Design an enzyme around this catalytic site. Structure first.
Site, PDB file in Angstrom:
ATOM      1  N   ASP A   1      11.825   5.507  78.420  1.00  0.00           N
ATOM      2  CA  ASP A   1      10.881   5.103  77.924  1.00  0.00           C
ATOM      3  C   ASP A   1      11.430   3.722  77.842  1.00  0.00           C
ATOM      4  O   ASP A   1      10.064   2.553  76.814  1.00  0.00           O
ATOM      5  CB  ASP A   1      11.900   5.716  76.027  1.00  0.00           C
TER       6      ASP A   1
ATOM      7  N   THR B   1      13.783  -0.330  66.579  1.00  0.00           N
ATOM      8  CA  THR B   1      14.284   0.073  64.964  1.00  0.00           C
ATOM      9  C   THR B   1      15.019  -0.622  64.488  1.00  0.00           C
ATOM     10  O   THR B   1      15.448  -1.083  65.176  1.00  0.00           O
ATOM     11  CB  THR B   1      15.157   1.866  65.011  1.00  0.00           C
TER      12      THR B   1
ATOM     13  N   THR C   1      19.247   3.620  71.482  1.00  0.00           N
ATOM     14  CA  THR C   1      20.004   4.884  73.099  1.00  0.00           C
ATOM     15  C   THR C   1      20.042   3.583  73.916  1.00  0.00           C
ATOM     16  O   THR C   1      19.461   2.888  74.762  1.00  0.00           O
ATOM     17  CB  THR C   1      19.222   5.707  72.527  1.00  0.00           C
TER      18      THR C   1
ATOM     19  N   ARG D   1       7.023  10.571  72.331  1.00  0.00           N
ATOM     20  CA  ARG D   1       6.677  12.132  71.444  1.00  0.00           C
ATOM     21  C   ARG D   1       6.652  13.490  72.123  1.00  0.00           C
ATOM     22  O   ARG D   1       7.192  14.553  71.962  1.00  0.00           O
ATOM     23  CB  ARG D   1       5.425  11.437  69.895  1.00  0.00           C
TER      24      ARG D   1
ATOM     25  N   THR E   1      12.298   9.529  67.879  1.00  0.00           N
ATOM     26  CA  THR E   1      11.111   9.553  68.809  1.00  0.00           C
ATOM     27  C   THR E   1       9.988   9.611  67.018  1.00  0.00           C
ATOM     28  O   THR E   1       8.419   9.712  67.352  1.00  0.00           O
ATOM     29  CB  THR E   1      10.601  10.523  69.418  1.00  0.00           C
TER      30      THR E   1
ATOM     31  N   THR F   1      10.001  10.490  62.681  1.00  0.00           N
ATOM     32  CA  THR F   1       9.853  11.811  61.740  1.00  0.00           C
ATOM     33  C   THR F   1       9.409  12.735  62.103  1.00  0.00           C
ATOM     34  O   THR F   1       8.110  12.391  62.082  1.00  0.00           O
ATOM     35  CB  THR F   1      10.754  11.439  60.786  1.00  0.00           C
TER      36      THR F   1
END
Ligand SMILES: CC(C)(COP(=O)(O)OP(=O)(O)OC[C@H]1O[C@@H](n2cnc3c(N)ncnc32)[C@H](O)[C@@H]1OP(=O)(O)O)[C@@H](O)C(=O)NCCC(=O)NCCSC(=O)C1=CCCCC1
Ligand SMILES: CC(C)(COP(=O)(O)OP(=O)(O)OC[C@H]1O[C@@H](n2cnc3c(N)ncnc32)[C@H](O)[C@@H]1OP(=O)(O)O)[C@@H](O)C(=O)NCCC(=O)NCCSC(=O)C1=CCCCC1
Ligand SMILES: CC(C)(COP(=O)(O)OP(=O)(O)OC[C@H]1O[C@@H](n2cnc3c(N)ncnc32)[C@H](O)[C@@H]1OP(=O)(O)O)[C@@H](O)C(=O)NCCC(=O)NCCSC(=O)C1=CCCCC1
Ligand SMILES: CC(C)(COP(=O)(O)OP(=O)(O)OC[C@H]1O[C@@H](n2cnc3c(N)ncnc32)[C@H](O)[C@@H]1OP(=O)(O)O)[C@@H](O)C(=O)NCCC(=O)NCCSC(=O)C1=CCCCC1
Ligand SMILES: Cc1cc2nc3c(=O)[nH]c(=O)nc-3n(C[C@H](O)[C@H](O)[C@H](O)COP(=O)(O)OP(=O)(O)OC[C@H]3O[C@@H](n4cnc5c(N)ncnc54)[C@H](O)[C@@H]3O)c2cc1C
Ligand SMILES: Cc1cc2nc3c(=O)[nH]c(=O)nc-3n(C[C@H](O)[C@H](O)[C@H](O)COP(=O)(O)OP(=O)(O)OC[C@H]3O[C@@H](n4cnc5c(N)ncnc54)[C@H](O)[C@@H]3O)c2cc1C
Ligand SMILES: Cc1cc2nc3c(=O)[nH]c(=O)nc-3n(C[C@H](O)[C@H](O)[C@H](O)COP(=O)(O)OP(=O)(O)OC[C@H]3O[C@@H](n4cnc5c(N)ncnc54)[C@H](O)[C@@H]3O)c2cc1C
Ligand SMILES: Cc1cc2nc3c(=O)[nH]c(=O)nc-3n(C[C@H](O)[C@H](O)[C@H](O)COP(=O)(O)OP(=O)(O)OC[C@H]3O[C@@H](n4cnc5c(N)ncnc54)[C@H](O)[C@@H]3O)c2cc1C
Lengths: 378, 378, 378, 378
Positions: C89, C123, C155, C240, C361, C363
């Site tokens: 990612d 985010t 992350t 996703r 990823t 909600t």
């Protein structure tokens, strides 16, 4: 209608839950602590033994009152509600089965502000849902019963001053061969195993017990030989309503956090409470909590009334309330998004705590079987 | 606590439902008949107008009593329960909004054993969930209002002697521009459209209405001009509890057939009641019916008490009771296997009838929105 | 059909998951450890960077291969699968958006057996579901961009050697005003906040990042100014599917433990696998895992094919796979009864891990919105 | 990969479903008609007998092709898809069990454009889920078998030219005592009972059959005596995938109507497609249809491959596809609001039709048992 004494007790419980129990809940789970502060506070306020009869220096509040207390405590700390469930559950076999002599001998020590603890020991590694498969034996030998066996998942087992132990006095008689015994802390042959590490309700003690040629006075038997299974089944009918009440509380507490978050959390220029899918989630959560609450209160009232319907309605209340606690806490973590998954925000603990309510006091598969059998074979 | 008059009324309703209404249900659906026998019988027994005030020659039994009656009728014939919903719903705007003069003029004809019918006409092709989008207009012209527009899905619309019609007196004022009017059968300009063919609740009349330069006396207005939307919203808060009660009844009736079938149907050498999955299905169905019943009774009691909480609890009751009727009827057909799919065995009709409860009196999407808004914006 | 290289890679992954990753999972969660052993092992086996292009010394395995790897790792350790999700990612924005110059400059260091880490930082506290609300700013000043802002839930954020940071270059342009930047570890102005304590996936690092007048070379921009939101949205379409694959794995691993338990656990005289309700629970769990697996594999194949349908099918796969992981792990704990709630038996950790898949990823509310919009506005 | 012949067949089926079958569906249900036009058209297009082997003048298109055809027909008319299910199902016991002599004698008449019909007669009033409880007997008497008994719910039973009848040749041998027989229309002793009135799939024939000293040639036995139960079980494994495909089709057809309605229906000033809860409903419906479609296609491919896994995957496909058809049709009626409940709009019929898919080819309780047993006792 609630009595003025019930209303005063509940206003006090709500105050204590908010001011004293809720601020302690995070640490209780984080450090896996026994709720000693709560136990001592409850003893002083006369909340530790609500079902202890007035004859033995108790408040004799009844099932409905305790169900209302458990919902209030479950809202802020499931583990603190578990202390009261285990405490009442440990003395119910004696209250409902013991001779006047046995009741005076063992219930008196729980009078007033006593901090002494009880436990109920039925479950074993070989006997969970199948309680009739229990292997613990009690053999009469003169003025004693010699008990040999083991128990597991015993709430407050290693700290209880009085333990109600279920054991076979006659293995060939099955459901008519089990007896119940009062076992005191300090009895030679009573051995404590491990305190198991759990997913949730971490502010508790869950013990393995071993009985190695454990001698108990013959006068410690609860009721006649072979009446133990009926005594256990009667106790489970009541404790399933306590589980239901605790689950209603857990679900409500999680819902309260979710609701407050929707009002404060702004995304897409307004609080998330303005989003229709969030409104629908909250509508579904609240409806399930209210339905579970109404079922639980009905079951509790029926138990107090001594109504035969209490078995059916208690079984329904236990299943729905615990499934609701699981579903509502899962959705409350969802409503808080990323913050919901963080330990500091409490709802994740409520989710972990909720899962146990579907398992203990009998699994939701056993309670669905009890409900189905009562409906189809009345 | 239920009054002795409520208990007598309910024992009578249960007797009538079993002896007279249940044997007629199959033919009522098969031949799509208006329940004329039931309407006439109810009028004679004083069951047709339970909410008609004592001042206008009525029984004034209150919402809880009618909810209990609807659950009893819903158990055997959803269409017969719909007759009572439509009948009460059609007079509620007049009872709660009409001047003393209007109430005497129009409610008196419903006194005692009267067989006259009512209807409520709000919905239009352009206005279902969005009631504010209604296009029907009422224009003041001297001593009359000239009404032009249309309505659809009007229960008993083509047979009602008194119709409450909602129309805009001021389209620019939105929620403050709607008015409510009493419209009598036989008024020139009142035109009946089609009686729509439905999936279920076939023993009913669902009408299209057209108003073509329809003149009504100016004194037929219910309340002041512009107060019609509030009058409609108040009526829907009550109507949603009636829908909930009918849905509890439908679910119970389907459950009763399923339970009896498990006891009689033998497969694998024993009645199917002995199979654990069948016991679980019945446990789940009964638990949902009981929870829906408790929510509905609470909502009904709150309405009778004039409690503000009635909106929230009625919205929850409507959603859960109707979802439960849909789920329980679907599972009752399942429990009967192939026989469940056959028209002669009734449960398939109950399943068809149940689907409407999720749609009328406002869809379950609208009721979830009402619930969520009440919880998040108290 | 899978290529011989894909089959060899997957046989190796299955072997490593069973022999090396599964025995480490309990301790990784208990002690909240970064999976350093796994990271180093994966680097040596060429499993750390599966999507790194062959041009930059990578294996360029494709989305389907990584989805199959993630299911295998998710089965034994969700946190170890998360390491691979975060790693891929963090480099996807550069692979798909970077100029040939930027790609050579930053992707080369990830060649072969490199152990260097990536992260994606989009985010923020003010921008979760509403990514357009992000406040981080990038201001061009000579040969640099001066970045000011913050990020949360990143992350591997505090350990990443390369971080892709999204920031507004023009706040007035909204979705056309965000840009993406390569930010290296050791850049002055890059500040690490807290490593948040989570319910599950504890064997990970989830960082707060702060940018305090952080200067980055102007040549570190990924693509043209204002193309950052499209770059982010393209990256999320792929990640996703990775979340979906990890969730399928979690669900499968929980199901495997449940199945083995039904075969070994004896109650009522036989293994619990003989009880029809247990068979039904397992049937429902397995069916949902298989359906989620088929949806995920279809979505992964569509991404590799560069098919426009990949957005719709990836959104469906993410929602269903994560809801399935939550439902299946909740039921796996149930199938193990009391033992299921104990930390030593792993399924409780899988349940805690599963909850995150419904949130990160994007909600499951956002993914249902993405799915619904794609279906209704094609 | 699909063959060019499969693609041509499917393009033709999609064209026929849209142009010819869909406009006939409303009347077929309203007037409970046998789909004679469709039967004759299918015979001319070579679509009536897709599994008839090439050796007997058939197309031998395989299970996957028929599953794709059934999904296309299920989309527009479940009853027309049932004609193809019953037709193939009625010849499968002969294709898979008959001697070369029996196959030539009875399959030849179904060659090319033949309009002759088949049926499978196993179910009886005493034997639904418990097929081993069937009471029909076959007694060898010289060159004949004398058959006595009854069957119920037999699709096309009263119109089939060839019926496969299951009967006990040895009641004491249970699962090893049933035999299968070819029974022709016009055989003395073959008596037709009632054509049962059903909730849905009304454009079909569901017959009671009676055998009163019915003599059949001894050479009409399918396979050896006592092999009938294995023959029946093998047929049901395939038949369950056909049910799954028809259910995927029903669900898709209902979803298509719902989607189009959200785009056309305006409430609150915009099409209802703009409302987030409507988008979520459609997201959930489509995801379940796609997952059911993928499971069904996998099960069909496994059957064509002769893979042992086909039993497990077919059982999962049948359960999920039919539960999905029930859930999606219930929600499609919901999405259309009041119009959804009207017979003219088709979705209510799709909801009625969907309920049968959960019951026939074995109930979803039996299929969950088959799935659970295959998973826990491999
Ligand atoms: C329901 C159950 C599985 C027992 O059914 P089977 O099919 O084996 O036995 P079956 O053939 O149904 O019955 C035997 C006799 O038993 C009588 N009886 C049943 N209910 C009752 C009753 N309510 N009252 C009196 N007698 C009863 C029954 O009539 C029969 O006698 P009979 O032959 O007819 O003469 C039972 O073992 C159970 O329930 N397990 C859940 C465990 C479980 O619930 N732990 C809880 C442990 S404690 C708890 O977990 C915690 C304590 C405190 C902290 C919180 C947690
Ligand atoms: C909820 C609803 C969708 C309306 O919300 P919106 O967002 O458009 O409008 P919004 O901005 O929320 O509100 C406007 C004003 O309205 C006041 N108010 C609301 N509730 C109430 C209330 N309970 N009491 C008084 N005022 C109310 C609100 O305060 C506002 O005024 P304000 O601006 O603040 O001054 C409404 O239209 C509805 O409900 N539809 C369902 C249809 C539906 O239910 N048919 C049923 C037809 S009848 C039935 O189907 C049958 C009859 C008998 C046989 C059985 C079937
Ligand atoms: C869907 C979303 C809520 C955005 O919709 P709105 O209604 O605000 O904006 P709207 O008006 O729908 O759209 C704006 C523009 O955007 C274009 N576009 C959309 N999709 C795409 C697309 N797929 N490709 C290209 N352009 C796209 C759209 O066309 C529009 O431009 P336009 O005006 O038409 O010219 C979006 O913000 C989102 O998705 N949030 C989930 C967060 C979220 O998913 N974190 C994940 C953080 S990373 C993750 O959590 C982890 C990383 C690794 C470890 C594991 C976890
Ligand atoms: C599953 C079932 C309930 C049977 O299990 P029990 O527990 O009684 O019997 P149990 O002890 O499990 O087994 C007996 C023997 O049977 C062999 N076997 C099983 N599956 C198979 C198999 N797949 N292949 C070969 N042998 C099989 C089994 O091995 C055993 O022999 P053994 O003793 O080991 O030597 C069965 O009766 C069934 O399935 N009912 C659903 C009815 C039902 O599905 N109608 C459908 C009627 S047709 C339909 O409704 C329509 C037709 C066309 C229009 C659409 C509708
Ligand atoms: C934290 C904790 C505290 C609790 N405290 C007490 C205590 O204080 N005193 C005490 O005596 N016990 C206590 N319990 C025990 C408890 O009630 C059980 O664990 C419960 O009865 C389940 O038994 P088991 O764990 O052996 O699961 P099992 O009985 O092995 O069940 C495994 C799975 O099989 C299913 N299953 C089993 N039988 C059937 C059936 N007939 N039909 C359908 N499905 C079935 C179960 O539902 C479950 O899903 C405690 C347990 C825990 C974990
Ligand atoms: C048999 C029958 C009898 C009834 N009798 C009466 C009667 O006597 N008098 C009367 O006036 N009316 C009556 N109703 C009308 C009834 O209340 C409605 O049909 C209902 O309000 C739905 O309106 P609609 O059919 O226009 O559906 P729509 O409003 O078009 O709804 C279509 C779909 O969109 C969804 N939707 C709409 N708005 C929203 C939103 N804001 N958020 C989320 N989802 C939304 C709905 O839930 C539904 O799923 C009757 C209806 C029927 C079918
Ligand atoms: C452990 C962890 C790791 C992850 N790693 C990464 C990472 O590496 N990089 C990165 O940039 N991000 C990462 N994420 C971020 C992540 O994607 C989000 O947390 C997620 O997007 C939700 O945002 P939020 O937490 O602000 O919740 P909010 O957006 O505040 O959502 C709160 C609730 O509102 C609902 N909601 C919000 N908007 C809508 C809407 N329009 N319609 C309906 N409902 C809505 C949500 O579904 C949720 O239920 C990580 C998060 C966690 C917790
Ligand atoms: C329209 C229609 C067409 C069909 N066409 C064919 C045909 O062409 N040929 C043919 O031979 N048959 C046909 N079937 C028969 C069909 O397969 C069955 O009806 C089905 O097998 C159920 O049997 P039953 O109706 O006797 O229900 P029952 O077996 O009595 O089942 C009643 C309930 O008990 C439950 N139950 C039963 N056993 C168990 C168990 N062991 N565990 C858990 N739950 C259980 C069932 O799931 C169901 O919910 C047809 C049926 C219908 C209604």
């Amino acid at each position: 209608h609630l009595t003025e004494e019930q209303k005063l007790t509940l206003d006090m419980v709500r105050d204590v839950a908010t001011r004293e129990i809720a601020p302690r809940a995070l640490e209780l789970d984080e450090k896996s602590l026994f709720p000693e502060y709560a136990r001592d506070l409850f003893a002083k306020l006369g909340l530790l033994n609500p079902l202890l009869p007035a004859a033995y220096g108790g408040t004799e509040m009844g099932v409905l009152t305790l169900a209302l207390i458990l919902e209030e405590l479950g809202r802020v700390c499931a583990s603190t509600a578990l202390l009261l469930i285990a405490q009442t559950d440990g003395m119910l076999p004696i209250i409902h089965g013991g001779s006047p002599e046995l009741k005076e001998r063992y219930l008196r020590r729980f009078a007033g502000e006593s901090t002494l603890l009880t436990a109920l020991a039925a479950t074993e590694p070989a006997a969970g849902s199948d309680l009739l498969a229990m292997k613990t034996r009690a053999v009469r030998q003169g003025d004693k019963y010699v008990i040999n066996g083991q128990k597991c998942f015993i709430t407050n087992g290693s700290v209880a001053d009085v333990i109600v132990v279920y054991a076979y006095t006659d293995p060939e008689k099955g459901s008519k061969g089990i007896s119940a015994f009062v076992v005191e802390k300090g009895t030679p042959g009573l051995v404590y195993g491990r305190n198991e590490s759990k997913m949730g309700m971490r502010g508790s003690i869950n013990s393995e017990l071993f009985f190695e040629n454990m001698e108990v006075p013959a006068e410690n038997i609860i009721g006649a030989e072979g009446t133990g299974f009926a005594n256990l089944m009667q106790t489970l009918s009541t404790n399933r309503v306590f589980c239901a009440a605790q689950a209603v509380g857990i679900a409500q507490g999680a819902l309260d956090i979710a609701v407050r978050h929707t009002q404060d959390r702004v995304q897409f220029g307004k609080p998330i409470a303005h989003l229709a899918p969030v409104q629908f989630m909250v509508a579904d959560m609240a409806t399930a909590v209210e339905a579970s609450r109404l079922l639980t209160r009905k079951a509790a009232e029926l138990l107090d009334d001594g109504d035969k319907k209490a078995v059916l309605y208690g079984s329904m209340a236990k299943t729905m309330a615990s499934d609701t606690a699981m579903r509502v806490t899962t959705d409350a973590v969802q409503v808080l998004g990323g913050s919901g998954y963080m330990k500091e925000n409490g709802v994740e603990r409520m989710m972990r705590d909720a899962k146990l309510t579907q398992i203990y006091t009998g699994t939701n598969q056993i309670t669905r079987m009890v409900t189905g059998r009562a409906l189809l074979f009345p």
